[PDB]
């Protein structure tokens, strides 16, 4: 649900990519958008990708995709 994985999602980010100091932060960033079904937190650059709609998973080292909430 919210344990790293290193999987990126090709699902459209619901807005501008905001950087998050933690994956936890990016979770709250997803909790913000009602459309957000999951988020891809790129821990590597520290970027948070709150993503809407259905997901699409790919192997990206650094991308932690939390399924919105666990």
Swiss-Prot record:
Disulfide bonds join 1-70, 26-48, 30-36. It is found in: Cytoplasmic vesicle, Secretory vesicle, Microneme; Host early endosome. It comes from the Eukaryota. Residues 1-70 form the Apple domain. Proteolytically cleaved at the N- and C-terminus after release from the microneme. Monomer. Part of the MIC6-MIC1-MIC4 complex. Interacts (via the second apple domain) directly with MIC1 (via the beta-finger region). Interacts with murine TLR2; the interaction promotes activation of bone marrow-derived dendritic cells and macrophages in the host. Interacts with murine TLR4; the interaction promotes activation of bone marrow-derived dendritic cells and macrophages in the host. Soluble adhesin with carbohydrate-binding activity. Binds to galactose-terminating oligosaccharides. Required for attachment of the parasite to the host cell prior to invasion. Triggers the activation of murine bone marrow-derived dendritic cells and macrophages and production of pro-inflammatory cytokines, such as IL12 (IL12B/IL12A), in host TLR2/TLR4-dependent manner. Triggers the production of anti-inflammatory cytokine IL10 in murine bone marrow-derived macrophages in host TLR4-dependent manner. The first and second apple domains are sufficient for targeting the protein to the micronemes. C-terminus encompassing the sixth apple domain is responsible for host cell binding. This is Micronemal protein 4. The chain holds residues 419 to 488 of 580 of the full protein.
């Amino acid at each position: 649900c919210v344990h790293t994985g290193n999987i990126g999602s090709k699902a459209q980010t619901i807005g501008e990519v905001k950087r998050a100091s933690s994956l936890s932060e990016c979770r709250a960033r997803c909790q913000a958008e009602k459309e957000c079904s999951h988020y891809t937190y790129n821990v590597k650059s520290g970027l948070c990708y709150p993503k809407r709609g259905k997901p699409q998973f790919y192997k990206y080292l650094g991308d932690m995709t939390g399924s919105r909430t666990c």
